[PDB]
Design a protein around this ligand. Structure first.
Ligand code: MG
Ligand code: MG
Ligand code: MG
Ligand code: MG
Ligand code: MG
Ligand code: MG
Ligand code: MG
Ligand code: MG
Ligand code: MG
Ligand code: MG
Ligand code: MG
Ligand code: MG
Ligand code: MG
Ligand code: MG
Ligand code: MG
Ligand code: MG
Ligand code: MG
Ligand code: MG
Ligand code: MG
Ligand code: MG
Ligand code: MG
Ligand code: MG
Ligand code: MG
Ligand code: MG
Ligand code: MG
Ligand code: MG
Ligand code: MG
Ligand code: MG
Ligand code: MG
Ligand code: MG
Ligand code: MG
Ligand code: MG
Ligand code: MG
Ligand code: MG
Ligand code: MG
Ligand code: MG
Ligand code: MG
Lengths: 51, 127, 159, 148, 185, 49, 58, 222
RNA sequence: GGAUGCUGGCAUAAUGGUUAUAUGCCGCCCGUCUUGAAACACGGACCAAGGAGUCUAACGUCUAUGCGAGUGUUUGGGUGUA
RNA sequence: AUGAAGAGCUUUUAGUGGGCCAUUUUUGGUAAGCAGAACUGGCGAUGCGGGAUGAACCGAACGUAGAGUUAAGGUGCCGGA
RNA sequence: GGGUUGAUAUGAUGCCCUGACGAGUAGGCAGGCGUGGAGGUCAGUGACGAAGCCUAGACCGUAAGGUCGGGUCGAACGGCC
């Protein structure tokens, strides 16, 4: 009789998606990335800074 | 005593009056649609009177109910009144206009005995 | 006065061609037309017999009859709010096979070949054509292809 | 009657369903069949081909009793026998007792062969008949004896 | 607002609730809409729709038609169903022992079917004998055999029976019907 | 005046027909009169048929 | 008093209200206008074919 | 026939399995999305390191919104909008990107705003304004049983598998997107950003391809 | 898979309705022909009552009913509480 | 490929058969709020917000109400900002 | 588009659920309001006051219109099919 909106009403959110419980448990909305030591070549930077 | 009902909504408590019933006496106030080719009322220009239409209709739960919450039922005698013996919380009696004073006494007495509400318990009373 | 005749407004349409006047090559007469064949209509102006009305120039129809020198073609013609079927008796000089049907039937037999080939192993042919999809990822190298920078040029007269 | 008529519904509306531009008028295209060879020609040719002109041969003082020749098809031909004896005659498919059918007393002048009487003999008295009808009768085993 | 693709508020175009005020037909409808609602059988829906039909869409069905229908293979012991009236036909001389369910029977049809050893049945007794349409055979009568249909589609080169009261020579047999008189249609 | 596909009607009412319209309201009374006349004649020829 | 002679204004709207339907295509179309020399043989060939299938699955 | 305990418990047990399946499928889809993002990131990085350029894949999906009212539309755009199911202003639909559809969009460019949607706005749209075409009716989704009943043929069990078939344009995108009723969006809560809508997004307007700026607009409209 | 709990005041013209007036904003005279009427286009000073798609002969399509290869009692006769 | 809001079919009948405007193509004409054609969209038959004011322009099409957001157009006062 | 005859109670054209839609001249169709008279019924109202008339008094209905109260009046009049 009434459309309850997920993205509020955690109960309807969990009715639709059971993964929403562990998404919040692991904080997958704030996942950190593995650091990387990659550096661009000189051609990329000199072409970018070219006039 | 009335049956529980919602708040009664009307959506137009003002009587729809004919265009120019205020301007000409020959033009009565009973609603007539304007059927004219250049009628501002037919064309619904801003600032004109409102026309009756079905969106103004009353809720079917609160239709035909008086503010007391009863539906009016005309009666001319105790036999017509007794039809509302088991319907006192829904229907209220209205004594007809052409009923005599001495019979109004009987109808009101029987209605008080049976618990029936009467909308006009003052017509043709002397004192 | 007005003028709406049979060959009205046909000046350039029933023109023959540039450097292709004269008689018609014999392939037009050696071609073979069976009932159900799809044919396009293009009137030759040098053969005045068996011509189509200008309406049917560039129209494609289906053969319904075959005679000594002519061919019976069915066409669909818009007349107001509907289509009417029209029967023309056209000499074959004004008639050539449509290549669309040949290119469809080649695909028909190719799809049949693919289906028979891949039913021996059940690998979900997916024979339907598909539109041109978006192009996939790729990598572009600058080895010998360093970017060449450009700039808008000023205004000059050039006269 | 008057109250189920659209005239009652047009009350209030100016033109009574006839329009404001066209203005229902007395006889704007003529009276009757006026204009058959003129402004009503397309109708008379689309829906009444053959209305204009005279075709054939005249007959002065034609009486419609010289041409009284009502037709009976073979397919019925036992309706002229009552239900009481029809089954009798149909199961006793025999000569020496064959039923007689005066089609004239029933009100028919000609017999025609539409289809499939049974193989029972029948005596058929008729003013006129057809080739196929008589063929079928005598193939069933009967006979057509003519009368006047 | 809406850019509407279809016509709004359009009736289906199909009859419900037959406009005949016959109470017995209304009772048959009350039964067969229930059966169509709860039996999962298409026969009930067919019969219910047919009970809505008009007289010209309910043409009579001849006993000779029924005999044809039973001369099919596997149709001799079937129950024939006519949503309409059954008329007699003297052009047949044998009739089988079938049972026939119909709204109305003429006296001659009833007598023929009974004399042949069969029984004449109503659509309510058909409902208890065959609630899902067991072993049934629905017959409809001819619709284009009418007189009005002769005139439907009147025009040049259609051959469609002009509307005319008096027939004979000198009634629409002239110009427009023969090349000697102008043209032929 | 000629219009959609309808039969050609020959209705002969281009004279002053409303002056000559006999409506036989007298059907019943005239039957009563015939019966009374037969009765009177029978009584007058009382043995005869 | 001159008037407007001709315009095709509104005619496409009118046609497309209930319009540009293809007429339709049936199986077994008419043999009308087809060569009589072909029709005359097709009659006999179909007769013979019906006879042959009848006698075949007789 | 007590039947209030045994069959109720069996139904609950059967639902527990479907929810487990949905949970694991959704975890898999998350792992898929995050890897698909991280890998194109690292590919751009590696091409920069090698002195090359990474040309990202052209998008397979657009979200189209009707930006113009219904009056005064020529017939070809009117038909194309009816075919994309954009029959009212601020109605939205997902479109598979192909040569057959880009030309449709070029025809209806002055009447729509379109671009490339993100998982976030797809998910928000399907969860807030999520309506299915069941027996020609607009049913709010509100539960995975509707989707399992009307798309279980096509392996789809959940609103999340539906979102997946949308964004990772699958074999059954046609059927999923047709099941989805056109999104009925409000006007943007912060406004359109420009003073004047019916110029191109490039010329300072609102219509046309705003390739990745459509997410902001749609989130303001939803 | 749609609001319940607690508390207070009044229990009456207090809320509300109607009506007149004031205020803010809007609001051109109806009907009519016309592409276009507020029109410097026509009718209308006011009021009451009257006042305009009817009946018939023959028909068409549709619908309903009755019977159904038949159908139509009512020109007429018989009878009658006429 | 996309969409189908059900597809197809028939019967009967009303009103109408004075048109006009805008973008663009175009004929006559010095030109015209002129005359005449082509395509679409509109007015006619349509109120609403805007263009002070306006049949047609912009925006948008209307059951009755509430809340929110906006289109076009605007934010010195008249006038909401 | 669907659901619902099950016994006991009232209305199957009923009740209920679900979704969408709602501009309109000419014109078409449908459902209703009101008037004079006819058949039937309410063993209906009525000189203890019918009908009519007046009533910035009240109620019902989107409306057509209906109902009531008060005043005047004097002989008849209504509801439903
Ligand atoms: Mg709801
Ligand atoms: Mg007045
Ligand atoms: Mg007007
Ligand atoms: Mg050329
Ligand atoms: Mg009319
Ligand atoms: Mg007039
Ligand atoms: Mg006229
Ligand atoms: Mg709407
Ligand atoms: Mg003209
Ligand atoms: Mg704000
Ligand atoms: Mg703006
Ligand atoms: Mg007050
Ligand atoms: Mg107050
Ligand atoms: Mg006040
Ligand atoms: Mg006032
Ligand atoms: Mg003003
Ligand atoms: Mg003028
Ligand atoms: Mg003036
Ligand atoms: Mg003057
Ligand atoms: Mg004048
Ligand atoms: Mg004057
Ligand atoms: Mg009067
Ligand atoms: Mg007779
Ligand atoms: Mg007689
Ligand atoms: Mg017409
Ligand atoms: Mg006409
Ligand atoms: Mg005129
Ligand atoms: Mg006009
Ligand atoms: Mg407008
Ligand atoms: Mg524009
Ligand atoms: Mg507001
Ligand atoms: Mg201010
Ligand atoms: Mg229904
Ligand atoms: Mg009207
Ligand atoms: Mg009185
Ligand atoms: Mg007064
Ligand atoms: Mg007196």
């Amino acid at each position: 009789v009434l459309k309850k909106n997920p993205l509020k009403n955690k109960q309807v959110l969990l009715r639709l998606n059971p993964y929403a419980k562990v998404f919040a448990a692991e904080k997958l909305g704030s996942k950190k990335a593995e650091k990387t030591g990659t550096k661009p070549a000189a051609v990329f930077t000199e072409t970018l800074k070219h006039d | 005593a009335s049956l529980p009902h919602p708040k009664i909504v009307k959506k137009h408590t003002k009587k729809f009056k004919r265009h120019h019933s205020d301007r000409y006496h020959r033009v009565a106030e009973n609603w007539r649609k304007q059927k004219g080719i250049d009628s501002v009322v037919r064309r619904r220009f801003r600032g004109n009177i409102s026309q009756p239409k079905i969106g103004y209709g009353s809720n079917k739960k609160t239709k035909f109910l008086s503010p007391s919450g009863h539906k009016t039922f005309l009666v001319a005698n105790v036999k017509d009144l007794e039809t509302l013996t088991m319907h006192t919380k829904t229907y209220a009696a209205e004594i007809a206009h052409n009923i005599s004073a001495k019979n109004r006494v009987v109808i009101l007495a029987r209605a008080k005995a049976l618990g029936i509400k009467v909308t006009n318990p003052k017509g043709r009373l002397a004192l | 006065g007005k003028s709406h005749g049979y060959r009205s407004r046909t000046r350039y349409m029933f023109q023959r061609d540039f450097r292709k006047h004269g008689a018609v090559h014999l392939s037009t007469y050696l071609k073979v037309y069976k009932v159900g064949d799809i044919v396009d209509i293009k009137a030759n102006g040098s053969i005045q017999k068996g011509m189509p009305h200008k309406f049917y120039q560039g129209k494609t129809g289906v053969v319904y009859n075959v005679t000594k020198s002519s061919v019976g073609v069915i066409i669909n013609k818009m007349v107001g709010n509907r289509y009417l079927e029209k029967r023309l008796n056209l000499r074959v000089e004004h008639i050539k096979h449509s290549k669309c049907r040949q290119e469809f039937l080649e695909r028909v037999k190719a799809n049949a070949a693919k289906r028979a080939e891949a039913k021996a192993q059940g690998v979900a042919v997916q024979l339907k054509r598909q539109p041109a999809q978006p192009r996939e990822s790729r990598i572009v190298s600058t080895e010998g292809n360093v970017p060449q920078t450009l700039a808008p040029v000023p205004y000059e007269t050039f006269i | 009657p008057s109250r189920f008529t659209k005239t009652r519904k047009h009350r209030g509306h100016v033109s009574a369903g006839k329009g404001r531009i066209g203005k229902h008028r007395k006889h704007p295209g003529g009276r009757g069949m006026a204009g058959g060879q003129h402004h009503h020609r397309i109708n008379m040719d689309k829906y009444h081909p053959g209305y204009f002109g005279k075709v054939g041969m005249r007959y002065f003082h034609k009486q419609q009793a010289h041409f009284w020749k009502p037709v009976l098809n073979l397919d019925k031909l036992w309706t002229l026998i009552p239900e009481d004896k029809r089954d009798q005659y149909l199961k006793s498919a025999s000569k020496e007792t064959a039923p007689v059918i005066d089609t004239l007393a029933a009100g028919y002048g000609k017999i025609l062969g539409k289809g499939r009487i049974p193989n029972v003999p029948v005596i058929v008295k008729a003013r006129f008949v057809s080739k196929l009808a008589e063929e079928k009768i005598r193939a069933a085993g009967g006979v057509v004896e003519l009368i006047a | 607002g809406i850019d509407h693709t279809s016509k709004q508020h359009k009736r289906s175009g199909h009859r419900t609730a037959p406009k005949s005020d016959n109470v017995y037909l209304k009772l048959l409808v009350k039964l067969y809409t229930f059966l169509a609602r709860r039996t999962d059988a298409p026969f009930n829906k067919v019969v219910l729709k047919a009970l809505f039909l008009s007289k010209i869409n309910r043409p009579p069905v001849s006993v000779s038609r029924i005999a044809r229908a039973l001369k099919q293979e596997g149709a001799a012991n079937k129950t024939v169903v006519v949503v309409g009236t059954v008329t007699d036909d003297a052009r047949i001389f044998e009739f089988p022992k079938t049972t026939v369910a119909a709204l109305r029977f003429t006296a001659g049809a009833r007598a023929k079917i009974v004399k042949a050893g069969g029984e004449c049945i109503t659509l309510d007794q058909l409902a208890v004998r065959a609630p899902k349409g067991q072993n049934t055979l629905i017959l409809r009568g001819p619709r284009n055999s009418r007189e009005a249909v002769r005139h439907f589609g009147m025009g040049p080169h259609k051959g469609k029976a002009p509307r005319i009261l008096s027939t004979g020579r000198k009634f629409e047999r002239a110009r427009g019907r023969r090349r000697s008189k102008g043209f032929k249609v | 005046a000629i219009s959609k596909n309808l039969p050609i009607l020959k209705n002969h009412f281009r004279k002053h027909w409303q002056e000559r319209v006999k409506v036989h309201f007298d059907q019943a009374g005239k039957k009563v009169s015939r019966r009374n006349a037969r009765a009177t004649r029978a009584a007058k020829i009382a043995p005869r048929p | 008093a001159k008037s407007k002679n001709h315009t095709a204004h509104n005619q496409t709207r009118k046609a497309h209200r209930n319009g540009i339907k293809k007429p339709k295509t049936y199986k077994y179309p008419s043999l009308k206008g087809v060569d009589p020399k072909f029709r005359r043989n097709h009659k006999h060939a179909l007769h013979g074919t019906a006879k042959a299938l009848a006698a075949a699955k007789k | 026939a007590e039947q209030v305990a045994a069959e109720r418990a069996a139904r609950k047990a059967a639902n527990k399995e479907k929810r487990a399946i949905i949970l694991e499928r959704n975890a898999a889809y998350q792992k898929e999305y995050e890897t698909a993002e991280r890998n194109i990131i690292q590919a751009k990085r590696d091409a920069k390191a090698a002195g090359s350029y990474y040309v990202e894949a052209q998008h397979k999906l657009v979200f189209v919104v009707r930006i113009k009212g219904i009056n005064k539309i020529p017939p070809k755009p009117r038909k194309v909008l009816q075919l994309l199911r954009l029959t009212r202003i601020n109605s939205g639909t997902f479109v598979k990107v192909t040569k057959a559809t880009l030309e449709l969009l070029k025809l209806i460019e002055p009447y729509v705003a379109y671009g490339y949607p993100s998982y976030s706005t797809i998910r928000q749209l399907v969860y807030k304004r999520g309506f299915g075409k069941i027996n020609k009716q607009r049913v709010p989704l509100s539960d995975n049983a509707i989707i399992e009943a009307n798309l279980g043929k096509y392996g789809i069990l959940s609103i999340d598998d539906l979102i997946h078939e949308i964004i990772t344009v699958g074999p059954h995108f046609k059927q999923a997107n047709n099941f989805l009723w056109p999104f009925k969006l409000s006007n943007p809560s912060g406004g359109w950003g420009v003073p004047r809508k019916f110029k191109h997004f490039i010329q300072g307007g609102s219509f046309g391809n705003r390739e990745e700026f459509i997410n902001k607009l749609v989130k303001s409209m939803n």
